[PDB]
Amino acid sequence: GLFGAIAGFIEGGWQGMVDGWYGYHHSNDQGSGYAADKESTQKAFDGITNKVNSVIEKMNTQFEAVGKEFSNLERRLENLNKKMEDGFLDVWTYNAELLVLMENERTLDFHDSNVKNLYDKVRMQLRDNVKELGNGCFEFYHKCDDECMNSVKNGTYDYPKYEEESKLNRNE
Amino acid sequence: GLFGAIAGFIEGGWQGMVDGWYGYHHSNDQGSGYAADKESTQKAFDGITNKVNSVIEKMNTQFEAVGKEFSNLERRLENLNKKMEDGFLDVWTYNAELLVLMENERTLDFHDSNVKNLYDKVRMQLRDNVKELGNGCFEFYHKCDDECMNSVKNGTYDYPKYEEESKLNRNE
Amino acid sequence: GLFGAIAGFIEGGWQGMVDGWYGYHHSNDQGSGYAADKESTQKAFDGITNKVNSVIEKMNTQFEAVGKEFSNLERRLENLNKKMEDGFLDVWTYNAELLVLMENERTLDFHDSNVKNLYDKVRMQLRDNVKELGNGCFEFYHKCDDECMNSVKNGTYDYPKYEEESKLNRNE
Amino acid sequence: NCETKCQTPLGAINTTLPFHNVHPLTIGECPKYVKSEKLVLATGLRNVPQI
Amino acid sequence: PGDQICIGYHANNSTEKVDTILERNVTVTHAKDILEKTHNGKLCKLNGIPPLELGDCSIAGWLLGNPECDRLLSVPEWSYIMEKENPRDGLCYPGSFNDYEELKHLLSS
Ligand SMILES: *[C@@H]1O[C@H](CO)[C@@H](O[C@@H]2O[C@H](CO)[C@@H](O)[C@H](O)[C@H]2NC(C)=O)[C@H](O)[C@H]1NC(C)=O
Numbered sequence: 001g002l003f004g005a006i007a008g009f010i011e012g013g014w015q016g017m018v019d020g021w022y023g024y025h026h027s028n029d030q031g032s033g034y035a036a037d038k039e040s041t042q043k044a045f046d047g048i049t050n051k052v053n054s055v056i057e058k059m060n061t062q063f064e065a066v067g068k069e070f071s072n073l074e075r076r077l078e079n080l081n082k083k084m085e086d087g088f089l090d091v092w093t094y095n096a097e098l099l100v101l102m103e104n105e106r107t108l109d110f111h112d113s114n115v116k117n118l119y120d121k122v123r124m125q126l127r128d129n130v131k132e133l134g135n136g137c138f139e140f141y142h143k144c145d146d147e148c149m150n151s152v153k154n155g156t157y158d159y160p161k162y163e164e165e166s167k168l169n170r171n172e
Numbered sequence: 173g174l175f176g177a178i179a180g181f182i183e184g185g186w187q188g189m190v191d192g193w194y195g196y197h198h199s200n201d202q203g204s205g206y207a208a209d210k211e212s213t214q215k216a217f218d219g220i221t222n223k224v225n226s227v228i229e230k231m232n233t234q235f236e237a238v239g240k241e242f243s244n245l246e247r248r249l250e251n252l253n254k255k256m257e258d259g260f261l262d263v264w265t266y267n268a269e270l271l272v273l274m275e276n277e278r279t280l281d282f283h284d285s286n287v288k289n290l291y292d293k294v295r296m297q298l299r300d301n302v303k304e305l306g307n308g309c310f311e312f313y314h315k316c317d318d319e320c321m322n323s324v325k326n327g328t329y330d331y332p333k334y335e336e337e338s339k340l341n342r343n344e
Numbered sequence: 345g346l347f348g349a350i351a352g353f354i355e356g357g358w359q360g361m362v363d364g365w366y367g368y369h370h371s372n373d374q375g376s377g378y379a380a381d382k383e384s385t386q387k388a389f390d391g392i393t394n395k396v397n398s399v400i401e402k403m404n405t406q407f408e409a410v411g412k413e414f415s416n417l418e419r420r421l422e423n424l425n426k427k428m429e430d431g432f433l434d435v436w437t438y439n440a441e442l443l444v445l446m447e448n449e450r451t452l453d454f455h456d457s458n459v460k461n462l463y464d465k466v467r468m469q470l471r472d473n474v475k476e477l478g479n480g481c482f483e484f485y486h487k488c489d490d491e492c493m494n495s496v497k498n499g500t501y502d503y504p505k506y507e508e509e510s511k512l513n514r515n516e
Numbered sequence: 517n518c519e520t521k522c523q524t525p526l527g528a529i530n531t532t533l534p535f536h537n538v539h540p541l542t543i544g545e546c547p548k549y550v551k552s553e554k555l556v557l558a559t560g561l562r563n564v565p566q567i
Numbered sequence: 568p569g570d571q572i573c574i575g576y577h578a579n580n581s582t583e584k585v586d587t588i589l590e591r592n593v594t595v596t597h598a599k600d601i602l603e604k605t606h607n608g609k610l611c612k613l614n615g616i617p618p619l620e621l622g623d624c625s626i627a628g629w630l631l632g633n634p635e636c637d638r639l640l641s642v643p644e645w646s647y648i649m650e651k652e653n654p655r656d657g658l659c660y661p662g663s664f665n666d667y668e669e670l671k672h673l674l675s676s
Contacts (some may be wrong), residue, residue: 002454004461009468047589054588058270061551063259068248076412080425081252087407087432088259094439095266098402103588110174110589117176124181124306134468173562178576184567185578193561193596198572220559227557228534228601230442234548235431237540239675240420241668253424260431261540265550267438268535272601276558277587280595282346283561283576289348291574296353296478305571312570321572420672518611523618523647527606536603543647544613547603556585560596563578 001112005119010136021045022115024153030145037118037153044114051107055099063088125157129166141166173284177291182308193217194287196325202317209290209325216286223279227271235260297329301338313338345456349463354480365389366459368497374489381462381497388458395451399443407432469501473510485510522546613646621650625657626671627664633657648674 001007016034017023021044023036065085070078119136131139142165144152151157173179188206189195193216195208237257242250291308303311314337316324323329345351360378361367365388367380409429414422463480475483486509488496495501520528524539529546535555536547583598610618621629624636626648632640635656658664 184564185576194576279558309573520611527608531603533603555602557599563594
């Protein structure tokens with residue numbers, strides 16, 4: 001995509017997460033499974049609803065054309081009425097189609113940004129205690145069990161605590 | 173944000189920099205304080221002024237409706253005049269509100285890009301001579317005093333010169 | 345730029361690649377030269393053509409004003425006709441200029457995203473077998489000859505195969 | 517006894533701003549009329565409280 | 568022990584709030600109000616030249632010389648014309664006025 005997460009490294013998506021839009025799954029000898037991010041998904045959902053309510057209501061007022069009849073000595077006036085109403089229909093039609101197109105593209109790239117950002121957010125957290133596989137997955141230089149996996153999720157995985165085991169554990 | 177710098181890792185901003193929009197502060201045993209980037213801030217300011225002068229002047233020409241009176245046998249003509257002038261007001265109102273909304277969002281994400289980009293610009297410079305804390309701060313594998321801090325600022329911090337001290341200095 | 349690749353680290357561009365929009369050149373003792381990416385360039389080209397065909401055809405219908413004459417007792421009707429046709433010209437003119445401006449900016453930043461993304465795509469592939477110079481170039485911790493350079497291009501450079509030579513080869 | 521460069525039936529206008537929600541029918545060199553309540557241009561960036 | 572250099576942006580006491588498509592009311596450092604919501608509630612001269620107030624009289628009543636329109640018998644140059652919605656004094660003797668609106672529009676110039 002535009003931020004390179006989707007059809008970038010992540011390369012596809014998981015039918016196995018119904019919990020929300022994006023998230024994780026892990027391999028712990030302890031256990032493995034799909035759990036999706038509360039905060040990011042929430043945010044994106046809110047933003048989107050705001051976008052659709054913002055568009056559909058940005059035509060609340062908008063041109064509506066009703067009726068008219070003219071004599072055959074009124075021909076100019078008739079043509080003028082026609083050209084105007086037609087003109088406005090054209091205008092609002094353009095406005096609508098275009099706004100939809102833009103907001104669409106902007107929406108998709110928006111999702112991209114969300115993903116890539118979530119990723120970078122994880123990376124800047126766990127960074128040197130793990131290898132980035134380049135596929136959008138983090139291989140461990142130690143064991144983070146699950147409580148602490150969920151500590152990764154909640155945003156504090158407590159770096160220095162797990163620093164040393166991986167510090168010696170890595171190399172080789 | 174969209175580029176993840178603001179309300180991303182940087183997490184907040186410094187009331188202690190009045191010097192411009194974004195920049196740095198450092199801890200040198202030599203000294204510490206807030207100094208903000210000349211070039212980036214300058215650029216962003218220019219771009220923004222160009223955006224506002226671009227919008228406010230994108231309505232210079234724009235529809236202005238003055239007066240009219242019709243007889244009571246002119247009722248159709250009156251209604252047509254009304255529908256047209258109203259129609260245009262609606263149109264320009266939409267155009268304005270919408271343009272503002274877009275340019276706003278695009279402006280904010282713009283600032284984001286500026287920040288994240290400045291950061292990445294620093295990182296790609298100092299990279300292996302320092303630890304990224306993940307909070308948007310760079311911890312040193314050597315001492316960069318201040319002249320050389322300002323060499324970081326000016327864009328050439330002279331990597332290989334300081335390479336070795338940190339090369340052995342790191343690990344542990 | 346917005347994604348920081350152009351007039352960011354890459355700092356300029358190569359008159360020596362006519363093969364397409366963006367790509368690489370390498371130094372192999374084996375050989376050196378400019379070759380540009382098939383897939384990315386193709387994609388961008390397609391997207392752009394879609395953008396221009398999308399704009400130029402988003403006015404296919406659009407207001408066209410033909411003729412009219414009024415008596416000197418028709419003055420109000422005349423002024424109304426004038427105000428309307430003028431009004432629409434103004435409207436479509438605005439629509440056009442604006443759409444062009446946006447699609448332009450969005451196009452340039454689009455190219456940026458393409459570049460930065462291609463780069464990150466390479467990096468996430470070769471990562472620890474090479475040093476990022478920060479200038480937008482990758483220095484080798486081993487020899488990738490050319491077949492395998494073209495394996496970098498085709499997207500599988502076979503990491504673990506070349507892992508060890510660089511694993512010991514690096515440090516120092 | 518007031519003087520103005522722009523007049524509306526509801527009152528006059530002294531403004532550097534290129535827009536008004538006041539009245540559709542004006543006389544003078546005037547800012548452009550719209551039906552908006554608020555028009556607000558972001559200049560700076562978002563405010564994140566220092567934490 | 569060490570040396571370090573951070574990176575960050577501005578911030579202030581500003582409550583100034585904008586909107587966007589993606590996000591509703593949002594507080595930012597700086598903004599410009601491009602809309603003028605205020606008027607002095609007065610009717611004024613226009614570049615030193617005062618309007619012609621028709622008072623209780625219509626345009627017809629004026630031009631025709633309705634007796635109730637008197638001070639209007641002689642009048643200086645004007646920047647514009649102030650007339651009421653439904654003025655009291657027009658045609659005292661009942662009647663009709665042909666192409667009245669076309670005439671008033673003519674007067675706009
Ligand atoms: C239109 O607005 C301007 C600006 O407020 C007014 O001019 C100011 O008048 C005040 C009071 O005399 C002075 O202190 C300022 O120096 C003036 N500024 C400028 C730019 O001229 C002006 O009075 C207003 N017009 C009217 C007639 O109300």
